[PDB]
DNA sequence: ACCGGGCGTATTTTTTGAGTTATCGAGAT
DNA sequence: ATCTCGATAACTCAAAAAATACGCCCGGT
């Protein structure tokens, strides 16, 4: 009841949409374009919904890869490596909600799950005329995608301090 | 820590030839012999620069004339990393850095790109090193204890690399405590926070002192001021001595009272006297009416607020719902779970809901899209600022006509001093007893100061059971009697010296018997590279023997024969001997890299020595395929 | 019920400060400043009038009282038709004495006779030629007064849309503008049966009138204020705006207009809050289930010991004891600080659902306003 | 200061021998041959253990058994001194001494016994040499010997700077020494140095004490905003300081008319305040919200940080998605993401949690090896953050929870004057605590005073023109430095040479990178550097009048990087030869070496002996009996 | 009312001038 | 060494405009 205001503003739907645009974004980079596995899907809210956070994703240019972006936390004229490692933490609290976008994500012929717990995403042509903060997420989902992609699992994991 | 170089890469100038790699072993003595011409190793300046060397001391006119991309590789404890550098090119250096991580790295790039900059992978180090702390030694202030060029391995004076000059010297001679495991990062933390928590208690001691002593002062002055009270007729005749609780009893009930009135009789009462306090009673009633009509205008102004902030949230939940439509019109009535194979309609039922709450959000959003709302809101808020100003009007009229009647009459002129008397006595008697209230037995500043001063020793104890002095002092024993344990198998002249590192000096001191003396006088090539390698040997052991150490495990030793080789072999086998037995005294977490000249037989068959036919220095590192005369 | 309508239209149009009366000497009156009240009456104009010269020559002297009207009192006529006989249009015509004296010279002839026998009063019915001969055996100066600026009106003919329009003139919300009208005129209905009941004159003062419609218009822009704002009102519950479930529980309880603006306005800001917070993602969805729980736990306690020890008061009292020990109540959560009016705006948010109430019977009593 | 050696006298230890004599030539380079590495460096530690010494330096094996005394006899501005010591034998250091004043002396004493202690001949040496009884004589040996293993050594360019407190104290001292100023400017320096230590911790304290807990200033400020609702205070246009708002306060209360000037612009002022403060405590609320929650997210990682182990290392649990999804399966629901149960379903979302589980052991263990807890400094500034942010917050609440209870049924009679009357009597009694709180004079005035005197003391010192003394001085040195280079030897002598103080060293010039001793080696060039630029340094002294340095050096071995092999060590020579003729026989030059008598006889205006032998044949070998 | 065609228009896409920033060099500590 | 400041060049973003395909409007069935 009291809950209702972040039930609309963390919905699932547009969780689908964010996940969507990271996975679209992912492939667009990887060297063999592989699909990216499923326990990154869980980084995308947890890095994107949160607006600090999202602001080190959307200041760093899209060429200054994921390694640019973690080592902002931690500038002395920043200093918030404590977020750098709350991203974990954060992803370990909203699990319903990514998975709530998965959910919504496949069903919408968003994301086709490959058997071998992978996440291709399909064409399935943009939304039509959403708010320009929706926009920006989106577009942010899409670069941290893209930078996650230019990585290994293992690179990736370790320059976000988490533990699949 | 656990820190290792693995091997050594470059990348030509001319995209023409694969990187060269040049691979060591990990906790092994890595010799690497032969190169007779000795123009300079490159391997030191090679592996600073890639580790973050502020200026590139590759040699100019032989490898940065062909090399591109310096690079090593470092097993870590995060696993084995790849860092590269690019050449400089016609500068002093260059940020541009590529980094690649691995389990085992295996593959390596033909080419390279700037993958990240010289500061973040000095972070990246540093927190590595545990260093990222509150200034603090630094990743690249503990080159002294992992390098040894060719002059500091031997020179009698110079016991620590990059010790040249004032700034340097005085770093190393600060950061010591810290690699020593004295002052531990924690130490330094409680230090700040104490600070901190001291000057939080000086004010808030010198605040209390204050408000205790104003307290005190006027409470002093009770007893009087009850007698002016009960003078001014507020409080009845004190038959008796009085106790300090019901003296302030009787001061706050009188206080407390809505309306108080003065101790005069009414029988006689004048024309002058009943208009005062007729006009007394109409402002009364005016000053209601204007608090009820203030308190009306303040809500309304905040309500004002409130509504424009719940619009912003509606179109909030609107922009972060409207997607919820489309992603509804892409979804099939039904479909396959992704995880259990379901053909159900829990996406598309959850759609649906998302879509009602959309749908209830854009009605109240357009609720009143005629703007009947605000208007009447507006008219009211001009109902109630007129009806304000009407209120005011008519009391700045009462106040006229009582300061009027007042200034013409006297006996209501004494009157109304009076009250005022008897009111400005009930407002200071008020205040004191508020001060007096707040420096309660359990107020809320006497609580605070007793928890700070509870906290201030409590910190001060901590600090205090692990002391600075013992824990170097206890360090520096270890040290000593390793180093001379290590020393008595290696060759100097009388193997029975106790010794002592002398952190300020930054030198060994060896404690003959006829003469405490440093390692600056005693003149032989031999002695002193035998110091070198005790010391530097056993500060690493005790490094590898601590816990959260920040010291890369590895270490460098530029050419250990130079002092002999202007037989003399027999006693290099020794060094390299005892070395070995360093090596593998901890189960080879401890990695040698040594630039030498001694042929192979040297140390042919001694445990925990390799070396290759390959692993040349100086320019064979730079393959001669590349080499065109540039 | 036209009179109604006409002397709604035409007070609406009266100048400030004005006196009116009703059914005295015309159906309509308006007071200025000495005898001879200025009249405004409503024909079915006739020339003759078995009532116009009863009411005339009845009441003209008790209009002769001062501080009613300007002795060249000003004279008009509302007529729902065009026809007007000649008679009555030299009356309207007469704005000068002279040509009053002249047009009353015309009536004595067609109604009472010619000078100086006067053999026409016989002529007339007794009914009317005992009225006609009250009104001309009056100071004949008191006729040029009474006929000194006599006027006519003839609206737009619809006399309901008028009213509406002019109504719609004055600053207010149109969404509204009918009820106003009808309460308005049915205010002038009771009012006249209550002076007629009683057997006295009944009079509608402008200044009674007008006080009247203030007062309406704050209190129809009370209702607006306190919308729902939270739920789309039903468009049955829309011709009145119905506030919301805690605003009616509010009320329920009693308590004082500008409590109930603090306590929407702590609900608006409230609700922002949380938005606001789950847009930077520092709350999600179940960062705020503990407290709703809290929230309604500590509240049934709380209405538990309420019920136990104030139940001597009354039951509205009671419901404002709990009101305000619970947002008074203030306990520090997990370590989001809020602001002041965060509690009071969950507490409210709860009390919209019905899941927390105030009132000991607050289901009972919104189930009779309901009915009510 | 004019002090050079005349001779030298050795007391044997026995009784029947008699003392050793030597006789040097004052004004001239005193040359002395012999065979290097047999004890061959003595005269330099018999010379500083006669001047004095913290420790005897002189060789035990070789030397210190066979003398019972030392003597040294030195020429002087007040005439001839001899100087006696004694060997410890089993002690390091020995008081004991027997001194001598005068002119022009002949006698040579046979038989000494302790005249003097180590204090006062140091203390005489130092008033001699006019120095703050600091600097001291001892201070100045490093210019006076430049023994064997400083003579050609890249890093070592004085005497006894291997130790922190000798190059320090040699480093504070270039700054007298360098004729740039005097003792009495460095004594006001270095109080002048205290006193803005002092200074700034005070001045620290002081702006601690002035500004007050954000409580009472809250106080004050409701006191005040109500004061100016009632229309006696007019309103401020911008934020008024703490005094500024107990003055117009006090005034409000002395006044014996107080009329109310109540309207509906100070209701609506005080209602403008109100929800300005509201939005103020919106967004430090909100601030502060996430400054906490950063600090016990922190909390809760440093926690962990004891809980996983014996050491320091943090733990964080594991996504475990492949577990969490079953977490939530039960016997009601297989699908914990639809929310169904089917037999198919549960083996196909077993098979899926495998392949998860596969996908995360990829990098499962990887990243469980050594977490720590780099986050100290965020947590420090957020801790205090939090600490600031609250106080600032809880002073804002208060203030508006006082604007608002004043429009309840607090003002229902506060607008009438009887109770305007109450209300000023409540300000007249805060007004006390408010003016003892935060306000103080007499801490201001002792910052005051303390910056009045650094004033004077800048103003005595007149600093920012020693260092140009010492530009000019080390520029001379430079320009004489690359004089005496071109007479010797160097590789390079186009490069020039910067005596660079605050290393104690040199900084080689160089076009293609600045370079150091040490960086390049070429033993013959260092030796030509510090020849060179110790030259450079003494004729500077001798430059000016009244310099604490002596006027005399020695070297030892100059020429042991050469063991063709004449011509190096006769520039070098005759380059010495030609500076200390041209300073007029007034800097006393004693070089021991073990060139031939000849190859150092070539240079014309240099003296010596094939005589002079150091080392254990510097004692008569009568003396010599046995080891 | 439903399907299909033709015109209007909001949105996407393209474009573009302004503005913002990662990087580097030099400096300072 | 780390850190800062400033200069630089490249970048991206953001606004405006144009092209676009969509929705709305008009005519016929």
């Keep these: 009841m009291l809950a209702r205001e972040a039930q609309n503003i963390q919905n699932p739907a547009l969780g689908a949409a964010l996940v969507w645009r990271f996975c679209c974004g992912y492939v667009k980079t990887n060297r063999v374009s592989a699909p990216p596995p499923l326990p990154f899907l869980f980084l995308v809210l947890p890095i994107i919904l949160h607006q600090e956070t999202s602001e080190f994703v959307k200041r760093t240019y899209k060429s200054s890869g994921l390694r640019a972006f973690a080592a902002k936390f931690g500038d002395s004229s920043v200093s918030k490596q404590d977020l750098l490692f709350q991203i974990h933490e954060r992803s370990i609290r909203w699990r319903q909600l990514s998975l709530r976008s998965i959910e919504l994500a496949v069903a919408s012929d968003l994301l086709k799950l490959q058997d071998g717990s992978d996440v291709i995403p399909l064409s399935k042509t943009k939304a039509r005329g959403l708010s320009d903060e929706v926009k920006t997420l989106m577009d942010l989902a899409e670069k941290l995608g893209s930078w996650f992609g230019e990585l290994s699992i293992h690179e990736v994991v370790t320059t976000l301090k988490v533990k699949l | ?630 | ?372």
């Design chain 2, 1 to 630: 820590m656990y820190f290792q170089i693995r091997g050594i890469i470059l990348w030509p100038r001319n995209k023409n030839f694969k990187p060269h790699t040049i691979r060591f072993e990990l906790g092994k003595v890595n010799v690497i012999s032969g190169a007779s011409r000795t123009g300079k190793s490159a391997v030191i300046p090679i592996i600073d620069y890639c580790l973050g060397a502020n200026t590139c001391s590759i040699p100019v006119k032989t490898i940065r004339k062909y090399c591109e991309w310096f690079g090593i590789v470092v097993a870590t404890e995060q696993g084995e990393k790849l860092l590269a550098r690019k050449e400089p090119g016609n500068q002093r250096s260059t940020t541009d850095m590529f980094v690649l991580e691995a389990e085992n790295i295996t593959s390596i790039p033909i080419r390279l790109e700037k993958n990240t900059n010289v500061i973040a992978v000095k972070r990246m180090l540093d927190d590595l090193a545990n260093l990222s702390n509150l200034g603090r030694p630094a990743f690249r202030d503990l080159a002294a204890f992992t390098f040894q060029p060719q002059n500091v391995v031997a020179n009698p004076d110079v016991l620590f690399f990059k010790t040249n000059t004032y700034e340097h010297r005085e770093k190393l001679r600060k950061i010591f405590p810290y690699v020593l495991g004295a002052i531990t990062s924690e130490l330094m933390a409680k230090q700040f926070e104490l600070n901190r928590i001291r000057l939080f208690l000086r004010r808030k001691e010198r605040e209390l002192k204050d408000a205790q002593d104003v307290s005190a002062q006027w409470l002093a002055d009770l007893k009087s001021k009850y007698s002016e009270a009960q003078e001014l007729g507020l409080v009845p005749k004190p038959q008796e001595q009085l106790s300090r609780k019901q003296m302030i009893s009787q001061l706050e009930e009188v206080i407390s009272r809505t309306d108080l009135t003065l101790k005069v009789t009414v029988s006689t009462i004048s024309d002058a006297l009943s208009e005062l306090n007729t006009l007394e009673s109409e402002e009364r009633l005016v000053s209601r009416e204007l608090t009820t009509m203030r308190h009306r205008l303040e809500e309304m102004n905040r309500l004002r607020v409130g509504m424009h902030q719940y619009e912003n949230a509606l179109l909030m939940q609107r922009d972060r719902l409207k997607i919820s439509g489309w992603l509804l019109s892409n979804t099939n009535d039904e479909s396959d779970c992704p995880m259990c194979g379901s053909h159900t309609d829990s996406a598309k039922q959850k759609l649906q809901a998302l879509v009602q709450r959309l749908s209830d959000v854009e009605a109240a959003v357009g609720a009143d899209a005629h703007k009947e709302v605000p208007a009447a809101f507006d008219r009211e808020l001009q109902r109630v600022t007129t009806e304000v100003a009407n209120a005011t009007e008519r009391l700045r009229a009462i106040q006229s006509r009582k300061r009027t009647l007042t200034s013409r009459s006297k006996e209501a002129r004494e009157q109304q001093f009076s009250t005022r008397r008897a009111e400005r006595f009930i407002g200071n008697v008020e205040s004191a007893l508020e001060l007096h209230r707040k420096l309660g037995s359990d107020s809320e500043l006497v609580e605070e100061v007793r928890k700070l001063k509870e906290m201030v020793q409590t910190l001060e104890k901590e600090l205090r059971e692990k002391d600075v002095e013992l824990r170097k002092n206890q360090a520096l024993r270890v040290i000593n009697a390793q180093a001379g344990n290590i020393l008595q198998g290696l060759d100097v002249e009388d193997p029975s010296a106790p010794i002592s590192l002398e952190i300020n000096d930054l030198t060994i001191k060896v404690l003959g018997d006829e003469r405490d003396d440093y390692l600056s006088e005693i003149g032989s090539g031999s002695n002193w590279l035998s110091y070198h390698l005790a010391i530097l040997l056993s500060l690493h052991q005790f490094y590898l023997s601590q816990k959260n150490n920040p010291v890369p495990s590895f270490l460098i030793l530029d050419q250990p024969s130079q002092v002999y080789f202007p037989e003399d072999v027999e006693a290099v086998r020794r060094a390299f001997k005892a070395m070995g037995n360093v090596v593998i005294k901890e189960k080879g977490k401890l990695q040698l890299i040594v630039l030498d000249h001694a042929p192979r037989e040297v140390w042919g068959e001694i445990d925990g020595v390799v070396g290759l036919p390959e692993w040349r220095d100086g320019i064979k590192l730079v393959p001669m395929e590349w080499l065109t005369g540039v």
């Design chain 3, 1 to 372: 019920s036209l009179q109604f309508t006409l002397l709604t239209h035409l007070l609406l149009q009266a100048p400030e400060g004005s006196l009116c009366s009703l059914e005295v000497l015309d159906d309509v009156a308006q007071e200025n400043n000495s005898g001879d009240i200025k009249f405004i009456q409503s024909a079915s104009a006739a020339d003759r009038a078995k009532s116009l010269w009863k009411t005339l020559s009845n009441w003209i002297d008790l209009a002769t009282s001062p501080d009613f009207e300007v002795e060249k009192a000003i004279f008009e006529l509302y007529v729902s038709r065009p026809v007007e006989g000649s008679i009555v249009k030299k009356f309207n015509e007469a704005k000068t004495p002279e040509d009053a004296q002249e047009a009353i010279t015309h009536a004595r002839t067609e109604l009472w006779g010619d000078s100086p026998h006067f053999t026409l009063k016989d002529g007339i019915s007794k009914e009317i030629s005992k009225y006609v001969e009250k009104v001309f055996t009056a100071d004949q100066n008191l006729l040029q007064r009474l006929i000194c600026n006599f006027q006519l009106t003839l609206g737009s003919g619809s006399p309901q849309a008028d009213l509406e329009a002019c109504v719609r003139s004055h600053p207010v919300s149109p969404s509204k503008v009918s009820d106003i009208t009808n309460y308005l005129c049915g205010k002038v209905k009771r009012h006249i049966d209550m002076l007629l009941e009683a057997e006295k004159p009944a009079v509608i003062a402008r200044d009674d009138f007008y006080t009247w419609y203030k007062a309406y218009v704050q209190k129809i822009d009370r209702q607006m204020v306190l919308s729902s704002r939270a739920q789309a009102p039903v468009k049955e519950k829309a011709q009145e705006y119905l506030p919301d479930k805690f605003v009616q529980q509010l009320e329920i309880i009693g308590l004082p207009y500008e409590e109930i603006l603090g306590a929407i306005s702590d609900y608006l800001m409230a609700s922002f809050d949380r938005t606001d917070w789950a847009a930077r993602g520092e709350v999600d969805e179940t960062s705020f289930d503990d407290l709703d729980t809290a929230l309604q736990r500590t509240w049934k306690n709380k209405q538990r010991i309420c019920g136990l020890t104030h139940s001597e008061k009354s039951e509205q009292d009671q419901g404002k004891l709990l009101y305000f020990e619970c947002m008074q109540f203030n306990i520090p959560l997990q370590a989001m600080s809020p602001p002041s009016h965060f509690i009071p705006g969950c507490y409210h948010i709860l009390a919209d659902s019905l899941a927390v109430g105030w009132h000991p019977n607050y289901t009972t009593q919104l189930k009779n306003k309901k009915v009510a």
